[PDB]
Amino acid sequence: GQQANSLLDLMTIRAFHSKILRRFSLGTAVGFRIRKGDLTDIPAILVFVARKVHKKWLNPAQCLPAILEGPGGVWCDVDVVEFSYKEQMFSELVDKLCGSDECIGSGSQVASHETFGTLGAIVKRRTGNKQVGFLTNHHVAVDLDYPNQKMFHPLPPNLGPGVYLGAVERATSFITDDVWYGIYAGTNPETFVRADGAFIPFADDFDISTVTTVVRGVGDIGDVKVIDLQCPLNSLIGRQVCKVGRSSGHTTGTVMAYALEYNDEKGICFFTDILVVGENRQTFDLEGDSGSLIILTSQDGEKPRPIGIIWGGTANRGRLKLTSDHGPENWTSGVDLGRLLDRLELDIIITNESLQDAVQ
């Protein structure tokens, strides 16, 4: 008879009641109840519909209950959100990240022969030789069917001047929920979590001595921050995050929901990790920022800690409307950094001391 106070409890409650909510919803996530336009502190399951019609034009069989109970007597609220399923910045930071700098690092532009992207972090393989490289999104890194994919910065040789970074070695795709979350967050045989990743070691002839580990526009970042499923709920949802992109530069935002699910028509259930909406009714990211690091804003004057990377373009998928008298605002979807570094056995490099010593 207790109230949910962690992400695991809400995820288990949604798993118990997966069939009721999905009947008239375009998606479902777990977070904080949104009332009168801003987050409250009451845990709730956020269900996503296409329109919020007053419950006077709804038959009784379409009015979702506001309270659900799960295993062991855990209850939580139900909140209904109105979901929906090119302004490039010009500044001194975008120019440097697009290749007008003397060094490469996080937020820099990485390109293939066909698509652009954004450099993520500078990572390290935890096993074997422990080569040095970087990690990004495979939708900009791996072309489905050319046999080899090479990395160039800023542009490929067939499009402009650039240098050859490396080749894709390991790439990730949708994985089962059991390995990712550790629980059965659903009643479907085929539930996959989309977490793109790509480890590209630097070439043996590369000039790696002109790379940096500090984030341009954020300063110095700390060690990676893992997301625990049984921690207080106000530790992930409702916090302040930032991003450095090649197209939009430094942008700020906040975390709105966790564990977004889509349920395509063919029957496969796809989970999306994080939901980020920009601040001051701005956009958190453009299209082309896929790969940029997502870092929590420093609190009580500590070192900011990356918590994930941007999946890609969410404008095509749609936007969301927070209860207000203003127009809808788009969102941004992320991926957990911890279980994307564990699945690839990668280590975050924050300073040059761990870079110089491990380049041997």
Ligand X SMILES: Nc1ncnc2c1ncn2[C@@H]1O[C@H](COP(=O)(O)OP(=O)(O)OP(=O)(O)O)[C@@H](O)[C@H]1O
Q: Which is nearer to a copy of itself, 34 or 76 (CB)?
A: 34
Residue 303 amino acid letter: K
Residues that bind ligand X (CB under 6 A): 24, 34-36, 49, 51-55, 58, 62-64, 79-80, 161, 323
Residue 219 contact among ligand X, a copy of itself, none, beta carbon within 5 to 8 Å by kind: none
**How far apart are the C-alpha atoms of 278 and 253, rounded to whole Å?**
4
Computed from CA positions of residues 199, 203, 206, 208, in that sequence, does the dihedral angle turn out positive or negative? positive
Residue 356 contact among ligand X, a copy of itself, none, beta carbon within 5 to 8 Å by kind: none
CB of 58 to ligand X, least distance (A): 6
Report the C-alpha dihedral over residues 131, 132, 138, 143, rounded to 10 degrees.
-70
- Tell me the Cα Rg of the chain: 21
Residue 127 contact among a copy of itself, ligand X, none, beta carbon within 5 to 8 Å by kind: none
Q: Which is nearer to a copy of itself, 100 or 234 (CB)?
A: 100
Residues that bind a copy of itself (CB under 8 A): 50-54, 56-58, 62, 90-92, 95, 99-102, 113, 142, 144-148, 153-155, 158, 160-163, 173-174, 190, 192, 194, 210, 265-266, 268, 325-327
Q: Which is nearer to a copy of itself, 19 or 56 (CB)?
A: 56
Write the burial class of residue 165 (CB in 10 Å: 0-12 exposed, 13-18 middle, 19+ buried): buried
Q: Which is nearer to ligand X, 84 or 352 (CB)?
A: 84
| Residue (of 94, 92, 91, 119) closest to 211 by Cα position | 119
List the chain gaps (C–N > 2.5 A) by preceding residue. 85
- Cβ-closest position to ligand X: 80
List, in sequence order, every residue forming a beta bridge with 191; answer none if it has no partner: 269
Residue 79 contact among ligand X, a copy of itself, none, beta carbon within 5 to 8 Å by kind: ligand X
For tokens 């380049």, the residue is 359
Q: Which is nearer to a copy of itself, 72 or 267 (CB)?
A: 267
